Design a protein around this ligand. Structure first.
Ligand code: MG
Ligand code: MG
Ligand code: MG
Ligand code: MG
Ligand code: MG
Ligand code: MG
Ligand code: MG
Ligand code: MG
Ligand code: MG
Ligand code: MG
Ligand code: MG
Ligand code: MG
Ligand code: MG
Ligand code: MG
Ligand code: MG
Ligand code: MG
Ligand code: MG
Ligand code: MG
Ligand code: MG
Ligand code: MG
Ligand code: MG
Ligand code: MG
Ligand code: MG
Ligand code: MG
Ligand code: MG
Ligand code: MG
Ligand code: MG
Ligand code: MG
Ligand code: MG
Ligand code: MG
Ligand code: MG
Ligand code: MG
Ligand code: MG
Ligand code: MG
Ligand code: MG
Ligand code: MG
Ligand code: MG
Ligand code: MG
Ligand code: MG
Ligand code: MG
Ligand code: MG
Ligand code: MG
Ligand code: MG
Ligand code: MG
Ligand code: ZN
Lengths: 234, 150, 208, 138
RNA sequence: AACCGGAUUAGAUACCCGGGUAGUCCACGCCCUAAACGAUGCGCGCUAGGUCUCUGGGUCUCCUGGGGGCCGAAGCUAACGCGU
RNA sequence: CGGUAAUACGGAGGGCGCGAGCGUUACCCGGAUUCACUGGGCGUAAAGGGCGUGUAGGCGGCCUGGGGCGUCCCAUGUGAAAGA
């Protein structure tokens, strides 16, 4: 449960849009691009994974959050690989702070799914049959990963704290730990446990999340075969 | 367990076609008199619904107050906007000498002796906000020691 | 001259039993019995939430009216308490409890406060062998507060000391019931008084 | 020309600590050096050391800060919460031994310049000497 | 400008149209005002950056000065906003 | 406040505050950090002088040494009495 030679994947990103606060993890500027110090990555990785294994084998709940077009279908699988919830299509304002109200939409989703497995789907008129059709369609679109949250998460995992800052801001306010994959354009101070690296470039995203979920299930003694998410590279 | 005192309420009218339509502002202090106080500001269409919100918002956003023999460890000044609040420790047998607003906060905090002066903008809302941040910045000789231990 | 008039009307306005009437504040006639609401036409109307000054004001009256003193002597006693060393709160009470007219009642020589006042004012009270007819006279610890043998045969005196038989006195006082003597041992503490008055409220009334 | 090197040094530290710099340099001076000594003794700075920059002597001041805090604004609590130059040029401040203030009811210091040297408010009072009131630090 | 006319208009002591003197230009001497505005006095030290541009130097994807703009860290501000 | 239900006018009942006093007017300090030493400000609220030059004055980078005027410490004399 580690990696060394990953310089072959994840070197750097974000030519110069850099947040200055990220300077401590920058190695140099090669061909006009910020290259992230590779040793500094693993240093924050160890401090991050130890917290993960601790929270994992404690029984906690980690909200995996990623809306990037790159990280959409990788978050879907690796969070399903674990028992963790995920956010895929869009992060809704109040998913944490308004978690009470956002959860009531899950009750409608469960209600309409339950009423769509019952014989009563055709007992309603044709017009209500297409309306409640559209409800389940969008309610499953956004909440497919958020479905599994019974309480507020014990941890949050994000792949671009810059683009997901609406999600980090809430975890901050609710004092929920923020675990992040953060490249040059991210503010490091907002991340409790940071992994410096490309927020784009799928080749490296699949590696971090898989090794993350690999480390989660290893903490619970459910050792898993390789991740199915490797076929999404090409 | 939890005592709450009402600072003030207001009419806060809003203009619309045909006539004005108003909200209600409500400011409520919450305290246990054991060193824990909270402040909250409610807005609702009817008066009581405003105090309810204030009682809820004040139970969130609490402040641990380090009471030393019923007073503050040290004097501090706090500028919130144009409003400035000043707090100074008092020997017992003095009492809470404060405006209407700071007295309500500090009494529910558990302070029995303190000296207070409001300055600049005497606006109650800002005074309350200022007095709060004043209490968030209190430190103990143990606290300040643990900052310089290294 | 102090306040003179209806008393158990002021039992009502303070909302707390005021034993200035002496007896009959104990018997169920005090008008605190089955009439706790304040006097006047609007006494039975629902009272509005008192202002922060309203509370401080009523608490002072609740204390001042209990000893039966004008505001003049009352205020001066406070300004004396703030200068002396110690807690302004408790020291002020001990100064009130040092009033001769108040000690006379506290010693059970008289039934009420007003009654103990008249006993002093007419010279029936002895302090260390001399007559002292001033109700405002402050008693020092150790002074003997006695009854003039001229009055020891008065039926009003033998009346109150008859019910004082077996009755206990405050821990800062002691009395010989037969010879009609008495002694002020020490200044009472805050705990020594059961007065239903928050003193910090009264101090806070005077910071303004 | 620089006007008040002490306020300049007092500010150079004030400014560096608000953005949480690891270190900052101040033009080297013996009087300044005695100031920094009191701060390193009283635990407001990690310490200091002489250094040259482009040949000219300077003093690296290593700041210290509190623990990284909880939800929003994780920035740590300052070790130096306040620094103010008291006796400036154009209005000098000299206090006798009985005129020395108690800083933040004892939790802070008052750097005094005295005939017996640069002392904190406490050191100056047990020495029984007053002098120029340099600054508050708390 | 003034003023002489023509219109417009309820009226036109104006806007519009035809004229037209001082003046506007030059020299020499006065006058000393202005929204003379960045409505922000001068000098020096300190405090993230990104980008556009004028002008120097440089081992000339760029680095480094000195100006002129725009976003914006921390912070300040009653707010707008200010922000090397 | 009062222009038809006035707790604001005028009286009554009642209530509150002081009580041999209670109100009023004038005057002083206070609240007033509203002349800001403690303890304020001037982009738009009152407030940067139209700009420069430069006199007086105010202010003064780093190292050593003498002096000891400012500054600090001790002793002493003085600081009448009353007051506090
Ligand atoms: Mg931990
Ligand atoms: Mg959305
Ligand atoms: Mg990015
Ligand atoms: Mg605390
Ligand atoms: Mg201000
Ligand atoms: Mg104390
Ligand atoms: Mg004002
Ligand atoms: Mg006093
Ligand atoms: Mg003394
Ligand atoms: Mg006292
Ligand atoms: Mg006292
Ligand atoms: Mg005793
Ligand atoms: Mg007073
Ligand atoms: Mg004409
Ligand atoms: Mg005409
Ligand atoms: Mg017309
Ligand atoms: Mg001029
Ligand atoms: Mg200025
Ligand atoms: Mg060039
Ligand atoms: Mg420039
Ligand atoms: Mg800007
Ligand atoms: Mg900001
Ligand atoms: Mg009528
Ligand atoms: Mg009417
Ligand atoms: Mg009528
Ligand atoms: Mg009336
Ligand atoms: Mg009337
Ligand atoms: Mg009457
Ligand atoms: Mg009298
Ligand atoms: Mg005045
Ligand atoms: Mg003044
Ligand atoms: Mg004042
Ligand atoms: Mg004025
Ligand atoms: Mg000033
Ligand atoms: Mg000063
Ligand atoms: Mg001002
Ligand atoms: Mg102006
Ligand atoms: Mg100008
Ligand atoms: Mg001007
Ligand atoms: Mg010098
Ligand atoms: Mg000079
Ligand atoms: Mg000398
Ligand atoms: Mg004298
Ligand atoms: Mg004397
Ligand atoms: Zn009674």
């Amino acid at each position: 449960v580690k990696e060394l030679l990953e310089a072959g994947v994840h070197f750097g990103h974000e030519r110069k849009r850099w947040n200055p606060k990220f300077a401590r993890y920058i190695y140099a500027e090669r061909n006009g691009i910020h290259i992230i110090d590779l040793q500094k990555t693993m240093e924050e990785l160890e401090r991050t994974f130890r917290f993960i294994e601790d929270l994992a084998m404690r029984g906690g709940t980690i909200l995996f959050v990623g809306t990037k077009k790159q990280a959409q279908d990788i978050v879907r699988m690796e969070a399903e690989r674990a028992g963790m919830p995920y956010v895929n299509q869009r992060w809704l304002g109040g998913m944490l702070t308004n978690f009470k109200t956002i959860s009531q939409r899950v009750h409608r989703l469960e209600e309409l799914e339950a009423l769509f497995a019952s014989p009563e789907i055709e007992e309603r008129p044709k017009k209500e049959q297409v309306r409640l059709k559209h409800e389940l369609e969008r309610l499953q679109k956004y909440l497919s990963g958020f479905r599994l949250l019974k309480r507020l998460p014990d941890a949050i995992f994000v792949v671009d704290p810059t683009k997901e800052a609406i999600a980090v801001r809430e975890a901050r306010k609710l004092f929920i730990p923020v675990i992040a994959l953060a490249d040059t354009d991210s503010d490091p101070d907002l991340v409790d446990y940071i992994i410096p690296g490309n927020d784009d470039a799928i080749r490296s995203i699949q590696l971090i999340l898989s090794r993350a979920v690999d480390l989660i299930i290893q903490a619970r003694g459910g050792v898993v075969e390789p991740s199915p998410s490797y076929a999404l590279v090409q | 367990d939890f005592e709450e005192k009402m600072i003030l309420i207001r009419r806060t009218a809003r203009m619309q076609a045909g006539g004005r339509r108003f909200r209600f502002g409500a400011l409520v202090v919450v305290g246990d008199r054991q060193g824990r106080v909270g402040l909250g500001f409610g807005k609702a269409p009817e008066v009581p619904l405003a105090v309810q919100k204030a009682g809820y918002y004040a139970r969130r956003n609490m402040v641990e107050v380090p009471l030393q023999n019923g007073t503050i460890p040290h004097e501090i000044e706090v500028e919130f906007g144009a409003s400035k609040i000043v707090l100074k420790p008092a020997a017992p047998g003095t009492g809470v000498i404060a405006g209407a607003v700071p007295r309500a906060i500090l009494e529910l905090a558990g302070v029995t002796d303190i000296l207070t002066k409001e300055l600049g903008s005497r606006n109650p809302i800002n005074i309350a906000y200022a007095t709060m941040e004043a209490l968030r910045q209190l430190r103990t000789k143990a606290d300040v020691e643990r900052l310089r231990k290294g | 001259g102090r306040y003179i008039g209806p008393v158990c009307r002021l039992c009502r306005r303070e909302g707390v039993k005021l034993y200035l009437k002496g007896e009959r504040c104990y018997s169920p006639k005090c008008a605190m019995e089955r009439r706790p609401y304040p006097p006047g036409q609007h006494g039975q109307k629902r009272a509005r939430r008192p202002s922060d000054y309203a509370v401080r004001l009523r608490e002072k009256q609740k204390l001042r009216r209990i000893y039966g003193i004008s505001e003049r002597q009352f205020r001066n006693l406070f300004e004396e308490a703030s200068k002396k060393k110690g807690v302004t709160g408790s020291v002020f009470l001990g100064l009130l409890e040092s009033r001769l007219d108040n000690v006379v009642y506290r010693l059970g020589f008289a039934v009420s406060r007003r009654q103990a006042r008249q006993l002093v004012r007419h010279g029936h009270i002895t302090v260390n062998g001399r007559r002292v007819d001033l109700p405002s006279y402050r008693v020092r610890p150790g002074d003997e507060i006695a009854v003039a043998e001229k009055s020891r045969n008065l039926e009003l005196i033998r009346q109150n000391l008859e019910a004082m038989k077996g009755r206990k006195v405050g821990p800062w006082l002691s009395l010989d019931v037969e010879g009609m003597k008495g002694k002020f041992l020490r200044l009472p503490d805050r705990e020594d008084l059961a007065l239903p008055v928050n003193e910090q409220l009264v101090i806070e009334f005077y910071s303004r | 020309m620089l006007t008040d090197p002490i306020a300049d040094m007092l500010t150079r530290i004030r400014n560096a600590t608000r953005v949480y710099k690891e270190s900052t340099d101040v033009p080297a001076s013996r009087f300044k050096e005695e100031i920094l000594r009191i701060l390193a003794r009283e635990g407001f700075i990690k310490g200091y050391e002489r250094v040259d920059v482009d040949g000219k002597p300077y003093l690296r001041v290593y700041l210290k800060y509190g623990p990284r805090r909880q939800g929003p604004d994780p920035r740590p609590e300052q070790v130096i919460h306040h620094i103010r130059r008291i006796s400036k040029p154009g209005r000098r401040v000299y206090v006798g031994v009985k005129e020395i203030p108690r800083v933040r009811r004892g939790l802070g210091i008052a750097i005094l310049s005295t005939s017996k040297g640069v002392l904190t408010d406490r050191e100056a009072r047990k020495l029984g000497v007053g002098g120029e009131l340099i600054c508050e630090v708390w």
